[PDB]
Amino acid sequence: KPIAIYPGTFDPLTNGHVDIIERALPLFNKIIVACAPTLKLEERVNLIADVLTDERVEVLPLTGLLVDFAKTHQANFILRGLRAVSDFDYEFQLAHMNYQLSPEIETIFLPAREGYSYVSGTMVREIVTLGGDVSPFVPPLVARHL
Amino acid sequence: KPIAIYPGTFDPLTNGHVDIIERALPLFNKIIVACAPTLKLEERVNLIADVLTDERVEVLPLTGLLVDFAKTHQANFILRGLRAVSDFDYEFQLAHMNYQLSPEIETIFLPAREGYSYVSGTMVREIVTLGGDVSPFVPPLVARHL
Amino acid sequence: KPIAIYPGTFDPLTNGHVDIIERALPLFNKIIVACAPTLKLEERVNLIADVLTDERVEVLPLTGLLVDFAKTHQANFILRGLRAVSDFDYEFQLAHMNYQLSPEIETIFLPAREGYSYVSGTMVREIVTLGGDVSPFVPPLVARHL
């Protein structure tokens, strides 16, 4: 089986991110969750690693171009989730850009399910700042940490 | 009749904002125009109150979560205007988020009419910064103030 | 023939920008490439002028409202390129706004071709920051300069 990179800021990690990973796992020998910089990066990477206990998942900080990171980690797939039509336009453009940058890497999309489509990082982060309960939307460990 | 909250930054208040309020009034006992922070908040709230003379309208500063503000002010409806397809995606996601946060509150949309669809706050604000006449797009009081 | 203004930040100038200009030239006596501020403006204007050698092209810095700039330079057309559905919504709103600001000016669109649709300024700029090769996407002069 191939290896996939699942990049994001994960600021915070949501139930939606976890769902995408769990749903994609049967296709890949390994999924590497690559955390890009924007609370601290290392804190976020630790937090993700504690939530994602499946042995096929590795969490690392994303440095450099994603396609270079993918090459380095022997990954020929980029995993992305799609929540809405507004996502699709940007991801479609990024997939194309990354294809031109490195045609050996393929981008695949899983649709956000059910009650994950509205749950976005910037949305959840807005809630946290205003003092709202965000625990329905994130893993328990993340809620505790927030 | 129920009570609605009409939230926004209103920076500046446009003819389009006023139009949405006037058109929604027949459905509500009261509309509370909730001004979120981003010229000063208190100046903006004063300016809106001077423009919106209908006794069913109250202008207040928005603190905290919108659904909490709505609860506090006995409002079970959130009024939003929709100008374009790009609006809809974000408002649809926010309506869902607010439903999960507080299922007792309902979100309703009125479409922007006619020659209000292109008139957006960030658009009008760009014009002001560059020294353009923005008086066709805002209430006279707001034009004077700008 | 009429005169068109082709405004943008051109930060950096891409092959896609050049393509739009070349494709539009047969319709206009002159195209004025108007560079808005956001590496330095004057450096960017110089760089564009060196790339665009066709005598019907003039490069200048954009000051003030675009419709005022257009009037000053005897231009009754604004040239814009469209890459994606996400572009269209914003350009449609801006065209309308500029029509109300100055109904004598017309906005026209050319679709991005082929392998230019994904190549956007903020995309290319993200690549440069991370140390990627951006030379497939920009004119040689621009690549050298970056």
Curated annotation (Swiss-Prot), chains A, B, C:
Give the superkingdom in one word: Bacteria
Which InterPro entries does this chain map to? Answer: Cyt_trans-like, PPAT, Rossmann-like_a/b/a_fold
| Pathway(s) it belongs to | Cofactor biosynthesis; coenzyme A biosynthesis; CoA from (R)-pantothenate: step 4/5
Taken from the UniProt entry, a GO cellular component term is: cytoplasm
Which annotated residues bind substrate?
T9, L66, R80
Instruction: Detail which positions bind ATP.
Output: T9, F10, H17, G81, L82, R83, E91, Y116, S117, Y118, V119, S120, G121, T122
User: Where does the protein end up?
Assistant: Cytoplasm
**Where is the site described as Transition state stabilizer found in this chain?**
H17
List the keywords (alphabetical): ATP-binding, Coenzyme A biosynthesis, Cytoplasm, Magnesium, Nucleotide-binding, Nucleotidyltransferase, Transferase
The UniProt entry lists the main location of this chain as: cytoplasm
Q: Which reaction does it catalyse?
A: (R)-4'-phosphopantetheine + ATP + H(+) = 3'-dephospho-CoA + diphosphate
Q: What is its EC number?
A: 2.7.7.3
Quote the Pfam families the UniProt record gives: CTP_transf_like
EC class of the enzyme, as a word? transferase
Q: Does the keyword ATP-binding apply?
A: yes
In the record, what terms sit under GO molecular function? Answer: ATP binding; pantetheine-phosphate adenylyltransferase activity
The record's similarity note reads:
Belongs to the bacterial CoaD family.
Quaternary structure? Answer: Homohexamer.
Q: What does this protein do?
A: Reversibly transfers an adenylyl group from ATP to 4'-phosphopantetheine, yielding dephospho-CoA (dPCoA) and pyrophosphate.
**What's the protein here called?**
Phosphopantetheine adenylyltransferase
Q: What is the protein's species of origin? A: Coxiella burnetii (strain RSA 493 / Nine Mile phase I)
Q: What gene name is given for the protein in this entry?
A: coaD
